[PDB]
Short mmCIF file of C-alpha atoms in Angstrom, two decimals:
data_model
loop_
_atom_site.label_atom_id
_atom_site.label_comp_id
_atom_site.label_asym_id
_atom_site.label_seq_id
_atom_site.Cartn_x
_atom_site.Cartn_y
_atom_site.Cartn_z
CA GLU A 1 -81.16 -153.25 -109.69
CA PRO A 2 -81.39 -154.06 -106.05
CA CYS A 3 -84.30 -153.33 -103.81
CA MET A 4 -84.41 -149.58 -103.36
CA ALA A 5 -86.64 -146.68 -102.45
CA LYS A 6 -86.48 -142.92 -102.77
CA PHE A 7 -88.85 -140.23 -101.56
CA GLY A 8 -88.76 -136.88 -103.24
CA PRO A 9 -88.06 -134.25 -104.11
CA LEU A 10 -91.69 -133.02 -104.32
CA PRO A 11 -94.22 -133.60 -105.68
CA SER A 12 -92.66 -136.96 -106.66
CA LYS A 13 -93.31 -139.02 -103.54
CA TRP A 14 -92.25 -142.59 -102.77
CA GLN A 15 -90.60 -144.34 -105.72
CA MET A 16 -89.91 -148.10 -105.24
CA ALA A 17 -87.67 -150.26 -107.38
CA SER A 18 -87.07 -153.97 -107.45
CA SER A 19 -90.06 -154.11 -104.99
CA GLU A 20 -90.83 -157.89 -105.35
CA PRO A 21 -90.52 -159.12 -102.68
CA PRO A 22 -90.44 -155.79 -100.74
CA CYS A 23 -87.58 -154.68 -98.44
CA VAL A 24 -89.20 -151.36 -97.56
CA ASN A 25 -92.69 -150.05 -96.96
CA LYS A 26 -93.57 -146.40 -97.33
CA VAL A 27 -95.55 -144.94 -94.38
CA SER A 28 -95.61 -141.17 -94.86
CA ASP A 29 -94.03 -138.41 -96.49
CA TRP A 30 -90.48 -138.91 -95.22
CA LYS A 31 -91.08 -142.10 -93.25
CA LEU A 32 -90.80 -145.77 -94.07
CA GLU A 33 -90.64 -149.19 -92.55
CA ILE A 34 -88.00 -151.92 -92.91
CA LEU A 35 -89.68 -155.07 -94.27
CA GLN A 36 -86.43 -157.08 -94.41
CA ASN A 37 -83.29 -157.48 -92.38
CA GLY A 38 -80.10 -156.20 -93.94
CA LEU A 39 -77.28 -153.86 -94.65
CA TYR A 40 -78.67 -150.65 -96.05
CA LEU A 41 -77.15 -147.59 -97.52
CA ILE A 42 -79.18 -144.53 -96.77
CA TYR A 43 -78.59 -141.36 -98.78
CA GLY A 44 -79.96 -137.95 -99.79
CA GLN A 45 -79.65 -134.20 -99.99
CA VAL A 46 -81.15 -131.72 -97.60
CA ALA A 47 -81.66 -128.24 -99.18
CA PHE A 48 -83.10 -124.37 -86.92
CA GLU A 49 -82.01 -128.09 -87.79
CA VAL A 50 -82.80 -131.43 -89.58
CA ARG A 51 -82.61 -134.85 -87.91
CA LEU A 52 -82.56 -138.43 -89.29
CA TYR A 53 -84.37 -140.97 -87.31
CA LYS A 54 -83.99 -144.63 -87.11
CA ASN A 55 -87.27 -145.23 -85.27
CA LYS A 56 -86.72 -143.57 -81.86
CA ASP A 57 -83.19 -142.33 -82.42
CA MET A 58 -81.51 -139.39 -83.96
CA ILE A 59 -78.79 -140.99 -86.12
CA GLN A 60 -78.06 -137.78 -88.01
CA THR A 61 -78.42 -134.05 -87.25
CA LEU A 62 -77.79 -131.39 -89.89
CA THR A 63 -77.29 -128.13 -87.88
CA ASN A 64 -76.28 -125.61 -90.56
CA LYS A 65 -78.86 -123.20 -92.12
CA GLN A 66 -75.64 -130.93 -97.31
CA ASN A 67 -75.44 -134.92 -97.52
CA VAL A 68 -77.53 -137.34 -95.46
CA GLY A 69 -77.33 -140.97 -94.21
CA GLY A 70 -74.56 -143.53 -94.24
CA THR A 71 -74.55 -147.23 -93.95
CA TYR A 72 -76.53 -149.25 -91.39
CA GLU A 73 -77.63 -152.79 -90.20
CA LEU A 74 -81.44 -152.89 -89.95
CA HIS A 75 -84.29 -155.25 -89.08
CA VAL A 76 -87.86 -155.94 -89.67
CA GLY A 77 -90.02 -153.07 -88.24
CA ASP A 78 -87.29 -150.37 -87.99
CA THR A 79 -88.69 -147.13 -89.29
CA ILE A 80 -86.47 -144.52 -90.88
CA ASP A 81 -87.57 -140.88 -90.62
CA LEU A 82 -86.32 -137.56 -91.90
CA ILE A 83 -87.71 -134.84 -89.60
CA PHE A 84 -87.78 -131.04 -89.96
CA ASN A 85 -88.06 -128.45 -87.12
CA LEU A 86 -87.29 -125.62 -98.62
CA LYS A 87 -88.51 -129.04 -99.67
CA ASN A 88 -87.78 -129.49 -103.46
CA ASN A 89 -84.01 -129.58 -103.37
CA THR A 90 -84.60 -132.35 -100.71
CA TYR A 91 -85.08 -136.19 -100.89
CA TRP A 92 -83.78 -139.29 -99.34
CA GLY A 93 -83.69 -142.91 -100.22
CA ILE A 94 -82.18 -146.21 -99.40
CA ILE A 95 -80.65 -149.23 -101.15
CA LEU A 96 -80.19 -152.67 -99.76
CA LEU A 97 -76.62 -153.98 -100.07
CA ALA A 98 -76.83 -157.45 -98.66
CA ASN A 99 -78.40 -159.72 -96.17
CA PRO A 100 -75.77 -161.38 -93.92
CA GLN A 101 -76.86 -163.04 -90.61
CA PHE A 102 -77.30 -160.83 -87.44
CA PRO B 1 -69.72 -152.73 -112.16
CA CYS B 2 -68.90 -149.50 -113.86
CA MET B 3 -66.18 -147.58 -112.04
CA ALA B 4 -63.37 -145.21 -112.01
CA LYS B 5 -60.43 -143.88 -110.18
CA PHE B 6 -57.97 -140.94 -110.34
CA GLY B 7 -54.54 -141.21 -108.92
CA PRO B 8 -52.82 -141.34 -106.83
CA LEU B 9 -50.30 -139.62 -109.13
CA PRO B 10 -48.37 -140.48 -111.35
CA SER B 11 -51.41 -142.69 -112.23
CA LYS B 12 -54.00 -140.82 -114.02
CA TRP B 13 -57.62 -141.94 -114.77
CA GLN B 14 -58.50 -145.58 -114.66
CA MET B 15 -61.68 -147.23 -115.75
CA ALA B 16 -63.09 -150.57 -114.96
CA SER B 17 -66.32 -152.24 -116.33
CA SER B 18 -67.10 -150.18 -119.29
CA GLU B 19 -69.35 -151.00 -122.29
CA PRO B 20 -71.62 -149.32 -121.75
CA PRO B 21 -69.48 -146.62 -120.10
CA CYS B 22 -70.93 -144.71 -117.14
CA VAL B 23 -68.31 -141.98 -117.00
CA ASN B 24 -65.68 -140.29 -119.07
CA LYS B 25 -62.78 -138.20 -118.01
CA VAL B 26 -62.41 -134.40 -118.49
CA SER B 27 -58.87 -133.74 -117.21
CA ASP B 28 -56.85 -134.51 -114.06
CA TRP B 29 -59.14 -134.87 -111.06
CA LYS B 30 -62.35 -134.11 -113.22
CA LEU B 31 -64.70 -136.65 -114.68
CA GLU B 32 -67.95 -136.63 -116.55
CA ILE B 33 -71.11 -138.58 -115.96
CA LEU B 34 -72.57 -140.40 -119.07
CA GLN B 35 -75.43 -141.84 -117.13
CA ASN B 36 -78.13 -141.40 -114.60
CA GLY B 37 -77.66 -143.42 -111.57
CA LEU B 38 -77.07 -143.72 -107.98
CA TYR B 39 -73.36 -143.28 -107.50
CA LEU B 40 -70.92 -143.72 -104.70
CA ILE B 41 -68.05 -141.36 -104.65
CA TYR B 42 -64.89 -142.16 -102.62
CA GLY B 43 -61.20 -141.32 -102.23
CA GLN B 44 -58.85 -139.66 -99.82
CA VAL B 45 -56.88 -136.50 -99.30
CA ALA B 46 -53.36 -136.80 -97.72
CA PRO B 47 -52.87 -133.38 -96.26
CA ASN B 48 -49.15 -132.84 -96.23
CA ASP B 49 -49.45 -122.69 -95.53
CA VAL B 50 -49.53 -119.46 -97.64
CA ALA B 51 -53.05 -120.10 -98.92
CA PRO B 52 -55.86 -121.36 -96.57
CA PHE B 53 -56.01 -125.13 -96.48
CA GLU B 54 -58.76 -126.61 -98.59
CA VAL B 55 -59.85 -129.13 -101.03
CA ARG B 56 -63.28 -129.29 -102.42
CA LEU B 57 -65.41 -131.68 -104.32
CA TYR B 58 -67.80 -130.30 -106.85
CA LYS B 59 -70.82 -131.44 -108.63
CA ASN B 60 -71.18 -129.03 -111.62
CA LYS B 61 -70.80 -125.64 -109.88
CA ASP B 62 -71.87 -126.81 -106.34
CA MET B 63 -69.22 -127.49 -103.79
CA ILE B 64 -70.67 -130.66 -102.18
CA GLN B 65 -67.85 -131.54 -99.82
CA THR B 66 -65.35 -129.20 -98.25
CA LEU B 67 -62.43 -130.74 -96.54
CA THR B 68 -61.12 -127.93 -94.48
CA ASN B 69 -58.35 -129.94 -93.07
CA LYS B 70 -57.24 -131.16 -89.81
CA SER B 71 -54.16 -131.74 -91.83
CA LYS B 72 -54.96 -135.41 -91.25
CA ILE B 73 -56.14 -137.85 -93.91
CA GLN B 74 -59.89 -137.60 -94.74
CA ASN B 75 -62.41 -139.55 -96.76
CA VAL B 76 -63.68 -138.07 -99.98
CA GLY B 77 -67.23 -138.48 -101.20
CA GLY B 78 -70.50 -139.94 -100.26
CA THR B 79 -73.62 -141.15 -102.03
CA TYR B 80 -75.34 -139.20 -104.85
CA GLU B 81 -77.82 -139.24 -107.64
CA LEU B 82 -75.96 -138.07 -110.71
CA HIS B 83 -77.17 -137.15 -114.25
CA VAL B 84 -75.80 -137.47 -117.79
CA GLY B 85 -73.75 -134.27 -118.09
CA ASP B 86 -72.73 -133.72 -114.53
CA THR B 87 -69.08 -133.23 -113.79
CA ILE B 88 -67.35 -134.17 -110.54
CA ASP B 89 -64.29 -132.60 -109.40
CA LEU B 90 -61.72 -132.33 -106.71
CA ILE B 91 -60.05 -128.96 -106.28
CA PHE B 92 -56.97 -128.01 -104.37
CA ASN B 93 -56.66 -124.47 -103.07
CA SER B 94 -52.98 -125.07 -104.07
CA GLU B 95 -50.77 -128.16 -104.89
CA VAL B 96 -51.26 -128.55 -100.50
CA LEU B 97 -51.32 -132.15 -100.27
CA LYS B 98 -49.60 -135.31 -100.87
CA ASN B 99 -49.77 -138.28 -103.15
CA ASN B 100 -51.46 -141.07 -101.21
CA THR B 101 -54.29 -138.84 -102.51
CA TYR B 102 -56.88 -140.07 -105.00
CA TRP B 103 -60.60 -140.18 -105.66
CA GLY B 104 -62.76 -142.54 -107.59
CA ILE B 105 -66.41 -143.46 -108.43
CA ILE B 106 -68.72 -146.33 -108.64
CA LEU B 107 -72.20 -146.75 -110.01
CA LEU B 108 -74.42 -148.63 -107.53
CA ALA B 109 -77.74 -148.72 -109.36
CA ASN B 110 -79.71 -146.97 -112.10
CA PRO B 111 -83.50 -147.02 -111.31
CA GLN B 112 -86.25 -145.21 -113.36
CA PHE B 113 -86.88 -142.46 -110.89
CA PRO C 1 -71.05 -161.19 -100.46
CA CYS C 2 -67.86 -160.92 -98.40
CA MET C 3 -68.43 -159.20 -95.14
CA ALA C 4 -67.75 -159.13 -91.35
CA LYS C 5 -68.83 -157.31 -88.26
CA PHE C 6 -67.32 -156.99 -84.95
CA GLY C 7 -69.65 -155.70 -82.33
CA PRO C 8 -71.66 -155.02 -80.48
CA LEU C 9 -70.15 -156.82 -77.52
CA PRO C 10 -70.30 -159.43 -76.35
CA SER C 11 -70.72 -160.48 -79.89
CA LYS C 12 -67.16 -160.34 -81.21
CA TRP C 13 -66.25 -161.15 -84.93
CA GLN C 14 -69.02 -162.39 -87.13
CA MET C 15 -67.97 -162.87 -90.83
CA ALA C 16 -70.24 -164.02 -93.65
CA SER C 17 -68.50 -166.43 -95.90
CA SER C 18 -67.20 -165.84 -99.44
CA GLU C 19 -66.03 -167.40 -102.71
CA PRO C 20 -62.45 -166.65 -101.48
CA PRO C 21 -62.19 -164.89 -98.10
CA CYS C 22 -61.71 -161.20 -98.55
CA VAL C 23 -60.93 -160.55 -94.79
CA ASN C 24 -59.50 -162.21 -91.65
CA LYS C 25 -60.06 -161.40 -87.95
CA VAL C 26 -56.70 -160.30 -86.33
CA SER C 27 -58.20 -159.80 -82.82
CA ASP C 28 -60.74 -157.63 -81.16
CA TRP C 29 -61.82 -154.63 -83.21
CA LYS C 30 -59.18 -155.38 -85.84
CA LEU C 31 -59.10 -156.96 -89.16
CA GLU C 32 -56.77 -157.76 -91.98
CA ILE C 33 -57.55 -157.47 -95.65
CA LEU C 34 -56.84 -160.44 -97.75
CA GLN C 35 -57.84 -159.14 -101.14
CA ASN C 36 -57.72 -155.88 -103.04
CA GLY C 37 -61.15 -154.37 -103.87
CA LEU C 38 -63.32 -151.44 -102.88
CA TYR C 39 -64.83 -151.74 -99.39
CA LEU C 40 -67.46 -150.07 -97.49
CA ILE C 41 -66.82 -149.82 -93.80
CA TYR C 42 -69.70 -149.13 -91.42
CA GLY C 43 -70.79 -149.02 -87.80
CA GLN C 44 -72.04 -147.03 -84.89
CA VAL C 45 -70.22 -145.59 -81.99
CA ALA C 46 -73.46 -145.97 -79.87
CA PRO C 47 -76.73 -143.73 -80.03
CA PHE C 48 -64.18 -139.26 -75.40
CA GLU C 49 -62.82 -140.14 -78.85
CA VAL C 50 -63.27 -143.14 -81.17
CA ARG C 51 -60.96 -143.82 -84.13
CA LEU C 52 -60.78 -145.77 -87.31
CA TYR C 53 -57.34 -146.60 -88.63
CA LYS C 54 -56.09 -148.18 -91.91
CA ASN C 55 -52.57 -149.36 -91.12
CA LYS C 56 -50.80 -146.56 -89.27
CA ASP C 57 -53.10 -143.83 -90.58
CA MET C 58 -56.15 -142.48 -88.88
CA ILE C 59 -59.01 -142.14 -91.27
CA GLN C 60 -61.90 -141.12 -89.00
CA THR C 61 -62.48 -139.86 -85.49
CA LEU C 62 -65.77 -139.65 -83.58
CA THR C 63 -66.19 -137.46 -80.38
CA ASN C 64 -69.65 -135.78 -79.64
CA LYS C 65 -70.26 -134.62 -84.23
CA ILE C 66 -73.19 -136.68 -85.35
CA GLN C 67 -72.48 -140.28 -86.34
CA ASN C 68 -71.78 -143.84 -87.51
CA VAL C 69 -68.29 -144.88 -88.72
CA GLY C 70 -66.57 -145.70 -91.94
CA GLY C 71 -66.84 -144.69 -95.52
CA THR C 72 -65.60 -146.25 -98.65
CA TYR C 73 -62.05 -147.09 -99.40
CA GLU C 74 -59.80 -148.91 -101.75
CA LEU C 75 -57.99 -151.34 -99.49
CA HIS C 76 -55.10 -153.62 -100.39
CA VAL C 77 -53.94 -157.12 -99.36
CA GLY C 78 -52.02 -156.83 -96.02
CA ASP C 79 -53.86 -153.69 -94.98
CA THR C 80 -55.36 -153.66 -91.54
CA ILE C 81 -58.36 -151.60 -90.08
CA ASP C 82 -59.16 -151.17 -86.39
CA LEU C 83 -61.26 -149.20 -84.24
CA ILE C 84 -59.62 -147.84 -81.13
CA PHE C 85 -61.23 -146.15 -78.11
CA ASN C 86 -59.42 -143.82 -75.82
CA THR C 87 -70.76 -150.16 -80.71
CA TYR C 88 -69.88 -152.25 -83.72
CA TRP C 89 -68.29 -151.97 -87.09
CA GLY C 90 -68.36 -154.03 -90.19
CA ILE C 91 -66.86 -154.13 -93.69
CA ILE C 92 -68.42 -155.33 -97.13
CA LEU C 93 -66.56 -155.85 -100.35
CA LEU C 94 -68.25 -153.67 -102.96
CA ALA C 95 -66.15 -154.58 -105.85
CA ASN C 96 -62.84 -155.56 -107.08
CA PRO C 97 -61.98 -154.47 -110.64
CA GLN C 98 -58.76 -155.33 -112.28
CA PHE C 99 -57.16 -151.94 -111.58
CA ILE C 100 -55.82 -153.47 -108.29
#
C-alpha cells in the first residue's frame, strides 16, 4: 500500500497509511501539506459552491447544490485544501503514484 | 493488480490478477465488488434520437456519473472508495451508442480506513 | 515506472525511463504508445479551447469548465495522444494485464 491519506467523513479525521517516511502532513480539517515531490492522485466525494485548492489556487470548483480531484504533479510545501462557502457524506484523500524527476 | 474490463462487445467480462479476487461479474455491464479498496474506474462511451441521450454509471442505486452526451466520445469513471457488496454499472437509456464502448476497473490500494 | 511529461514550456518532453519503454515522443505535445496497458493521462491547461486526442478521436476538451486534463484509458501499441490548442501533460503506465 502506497503512501496515502484520507480525511473524513466526520468524525473520522485524518487517516494516514504507509506513513514511513511521510509524503503528506495533515494541517487542519480539510488541509494538508506535501512532504514529498511526486505524482499524486487526489480523490473524494462532496455531499453556493465548493472549491479545491492547491495552495493559492482553485484547481476545482463544484457549483451544483459529485466527484473531486484528479491527477497532479506536486512538490514539497504545496498545501491542498478543500474549502466550503452537509459534511458526513464528504471526504477527500490522496495517493502517491510515483516520483519521477521534475 | 486486480482488475477488470467489460467490452467492447462481443467481448464480455475479463479479469486480470485474481486470487484473491477483488470483483465478480453480475451481468453485461454490471460488476460486483468483493473487497474494500480504493478503486479507479475507467472506460469510454462511443456515442453513435427517440429517447433522450444518456448513459449513466451507478454505484448501488446512486447515479455517480451522467454522460449526457455531446455525441462525442467521453471518459467513464473516476476514483472511488468501494465496499464489499457494492455494484457498479453502466446504463444506456437505449442501445444509443457504439461498440468502441467499454468500461473497466482497477484496484489501486486497500488501506485500513 | 514508465512515464513522460511534456510541458510546461520551455520544458518540452521529459520521460522517466522504464524496463522496456512504454512511450515515445513523436514531436511537441504528441506521443506514441509503444505498449498496451492501462494509462493515466494528466496535466493542467493553466490556473479558447484545448483538446486531448487519442488517434483521430477527441477524448477531452477544456474551455472555461473547471480543470486539469486526462483520465484513464486502455491504450494500444501504435496509438497516439496529443494535446492541441486552437500548461503540461503527462502519461503513467498503471498496469498492463494479459488481456491486451
